[PDB]
Design a binder for this molecule. Structure first.
Ligand SMILES: [Cd+2]
Ligand SMILES: [Cd+2]
Ligand SMILES: [Cd+2]
Length: 30
């Protein structure tokens, strides 16, 4: 797992539009 970003790898993260990840890099919300 990652520190700042805590998005899974299943793809159920569906972050963005309300992401609180500090260092998120899910391609889109990167
Ligand atoms: Cd994240
Ligand atoms: Cd994500
Ligand atoms: Cd994100």
């Amino acid at each position: 797992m990652d520190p700042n970003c805590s998005c899974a790898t299943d793809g159920s993260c569906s972050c963005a539009g309300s992401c609180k990840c500090k260092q998120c890099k899910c391609t889109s919300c990167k």
